[PDB]
């Protein structure tokens, strides 16, 4: 008996109801309130220039055709009632292949208040596009966007708005960070307009600002490269008369940089320009190759101008460490301050 | 007022026959296509395919869907596309494609008072184009996308680019990491099979590969290995440890360069341009060891001649190698 009252209410709402017409068709503009709850900010891929996000995507609008009077003010119905009524055709402009989860049932909710207001949220996983400029790799920062709007209704028919102040209409869960090598500094919420071959559409935009973490590259690339350059400058302290000893010492440090340089480029993403890591490796390769060139000069002057060969090692024991000290001073100050 | 729209749309679909095309048993129906390219990505040499995302629009007139008394262009829910006749357009060289379905199916239906229908889809497709890699990585590729009607012949349907040369937009906003889109072209023609003659629309791009990535990955490491092999011209034959260490590191790194290069391309049966450089750098390191063996072989009999060869080899090898690069780059650029 308690359910037959609500069954007659639902049957009266759908009686003569057309779900192919937006509310207020030909009369007014359908206004849709939107807000997002980011349950997790997924991994960010440099190779594909994309990121994943899992959200609770909520929408709300007014439909005069769904006004009712009964025992309850709000009807919390099954998610299959959503297909019986009209819902907005929201899509993601920069989405790539998103998922609307339906395990174990379609992850949607639909609530109708007695004044016609509808609440329609769903759980989504979106893989969006995030263009990246990797000229400052690995000290780069990015603003990954997320744009959504109507697919078929122009701004003269359907307009989107944020539920609250735009800053408070996108909330990120505290335990949602799935980022490995990035730190999510914050997000900015905005709203724009796009014009296509089929009209003007309202676009709602959110940018998530990320900064890469440099800890991994210091251990793997920067520290081994710095020690190798320091190692190759110990060759200036070996006595000049040990030609077989300095020859092996000088050559094998050049070999070590070659092995380090090649290995560091396996993880570098495929781009057409040189990053901030490439310049460091190229410069650190010049220093190691200059020590070998210096030794060839000192060896050349030995047994012909022994006095001259003694001065070069005095200069190299200071000029080489000092220039590499200046380069690190200019290199780190240039990119960290960005 | 709004209830009048429902009655109108009810009459349009009452007695409508989805099984029959517009003007069935009569003149062919004209369908105009607009493509709005959203992105291009994953131009794969291994799979010989590229991924394309676009807003694909079709535009035809159906007199069975003409309404009067409503001065509006009816934009209906996308689920009404399952009750109307739509062209059976397909992409011949498509391998794996899908219409996006978040939050709903990305599809637009829009009627007009005179019966015109606008039908748009947001399609991501993985089309196939075979690549001639005989000049890789200094090569160009022509990759297309063939649009054809499956069931209806030229006596039933007609295709044309709506707007002419402006039917495809968004090409200039694409910035590929490794390619530059030199040009795109639009072609309309008819293709004949055993079952009849069918209309075909062809959209093609010409992609030029950027050499910047391969300079840092393959060419620069190869030159450094080759240049470092000239240290053997400044070392006495006693220093076995240094000269042995050179040999192992070169082949160990050369394999790393080669294996990385090999496992990024299919197993093509010809010689690529990058192979003409690696096989050219391997000759020089092969000749540097051959020079070392010959000098040591004649060292005892004619020590003066042994030193004379080493002094010349300090100049001839850098000069010959630089001449090799000069011819190589001028030929392929």
């Amino acid at each position, epitope marked *: 008996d308690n359910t037959t009252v609500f069954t007659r209410i639902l049957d009266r709402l759908l009686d003569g109801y057309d779900n192919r017409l937006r509310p207020g068709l030909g009369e007014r503009v359908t206004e849709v309130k939107t807000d997002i709850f980011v349950t997790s900010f997924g991994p960010v891929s440099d190779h594909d220039m994309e990121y994943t996000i899992d959200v609770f995507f909520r929408q709300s609008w007014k439909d005069e055709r769904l006004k009712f009077k009964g025992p309850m003010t709000v009807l919390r119905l099954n998610n299959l009632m959503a297909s019986k009524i009209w819902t907005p055709d929201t899509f993601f*402009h*920069n989405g790539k292949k998103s998922v609307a989860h339906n395990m174990t049932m379609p992850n949607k909710l639909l609530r109708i208040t007695e004044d016609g207001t509808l609440l329609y949220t769903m759980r989504l996983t979106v893989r969006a596009e995030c*263009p990246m*400029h990797l000229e400052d790799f690995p000290m780069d*920062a*990015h*603003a990954c*966007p997320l*744009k959504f709007g109507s697919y078929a209704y122009t701004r003269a028919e359907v307009v989107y708005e944020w539920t609250r102040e735009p800053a408070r209409s996108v909330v990120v869960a505290e335990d949602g960070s799935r980022l490995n090598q990035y730190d999510l*500094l*914050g997000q*900015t919420v*905005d*709203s*724009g*307009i*796009v*014009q*296509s071959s089929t009209g003007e559409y309202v*676009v709602m*935009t959110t*940018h998530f*600002h990320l900064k890469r973490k440099i800890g991994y590259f210091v251990i793997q690339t920067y520290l081994p490269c710095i020690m190798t350059v320091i190692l190759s400058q110990v060759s200036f302290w070996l006595n000049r008369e040990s030609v077989p000893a300095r020859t092996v010492f000088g050559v094998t440090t050049v070999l070590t940089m070659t092995t380090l340089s090649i290995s560091a480029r396996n993880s570098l993403p495929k781009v057409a320009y040189a990053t901030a890591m490439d310049w460091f490796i190229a410069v650190c390769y010049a220093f190691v190759f200059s020590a070998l060139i210096e030794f060839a000069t000192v060896n050349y002057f030995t047994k012909s101008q022994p006095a001259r060969a003694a001065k070069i090692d005095r200069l190299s024991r200071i000029a080489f460490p000092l220039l590499f000290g200046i380069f690190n001073l200019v290199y780190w100050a240039t990119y960290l301050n960005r | 007022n709004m209830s009048f729209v429902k009655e109108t749309v009810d009459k349009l679909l009452k007695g409508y026959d989805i099984r029959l095309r517009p003007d069935f048993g009569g003149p062919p129906v004209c369908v105009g296509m607009n493509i709005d390219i959203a992105s291009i990505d994953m131009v794969s040499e291994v799979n010989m395919d590229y991924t394309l995302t676009m807003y694909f629009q079709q535009y035809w007139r159906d007199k069975r869907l003409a309404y009067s008394g409503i001065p509006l262009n009816l934009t209906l829910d996308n689920r009404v596309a399952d009750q109307l006749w739509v062209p059976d357009t397909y992409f011949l060289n498509d391998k794996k494609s899908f219409v996006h379905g978040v939050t709903v199916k990305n599809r637009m239906i829009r009627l007009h008072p005179d019966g015109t229908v606008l039908y748009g889809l947001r399609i991501t497709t993985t089309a196939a184009c075979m690549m001639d890699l005989r000049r890789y990585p200094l090569d160009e590729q022509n990759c297309t996308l063939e649009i054809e009607s499956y069931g209806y012949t030229t006596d039933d349907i007609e295709f044309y680019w709506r707007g002419g040369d402006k039917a495809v937009t968004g090409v*200039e*906003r*694409i*910035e590929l990491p490794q390619f530059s889109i030199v040009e795109h072209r639009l072609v309309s023609r008819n293709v004949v099979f055993a079952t009849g003659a069918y209309p075909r629309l062809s959209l093609s791009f010409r992609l030029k590969r950027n050499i910047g990535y391969f300079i840092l990955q393959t060419y620069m490491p190869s030159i450094l290995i080759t240049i470092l092999s000239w240290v053997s011209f400044w070392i006495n034959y006693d220093a076995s440890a240094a000269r042995v260490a050179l040999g192992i590191t070169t082949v160990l790194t050369m394999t790393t360069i080669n294996t990385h290069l090999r496992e990024t391309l299919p197993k093509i049966p010809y010689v690529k341009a990058i192979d003409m450089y690696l096989m050219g750098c391997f000759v020089f390191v092969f000749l540097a060891l051959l020079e070392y063996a010959f000098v040591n072989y004649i060292f005892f009999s004619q020590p003066a001649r042994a030193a004379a060869i080493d002094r010349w080899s300090r100049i001839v090898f850098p000069f010959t190698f630089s001449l090799f690069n000069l011819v190589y780059w001028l030929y392929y650029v």
Partner: nanobody
Amino acid sequence: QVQLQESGGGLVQAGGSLRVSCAASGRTFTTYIMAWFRQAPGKEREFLAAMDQGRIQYYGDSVRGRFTISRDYAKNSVDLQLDGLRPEDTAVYYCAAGAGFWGLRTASSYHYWGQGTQVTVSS
């Protein structure tokens, strides 16, 4: 070097079209955001409009419905269309390009800036 050279811009009489054009050189800004900023004498530098690679147009509250921004990606340029000008619009108009880090409405996110252009409205 990268240069943002801004053409157009003169004196107008209390309303009327006045198109301001910005021409970029030395770099391709297809993946960047090209915006427009205004600086009245003494007040501040104010955001006017922007457009990204996806053709999404952002407008400030004051100039919404009056100014129109377009981008010509083939020629690597951005234009601003001024309509219904007022004497309060007399200022210097700047051209900016950037990646929109920490908000595209902030002048500190645009690494490349233009020289400027003077627009005067007489009533």
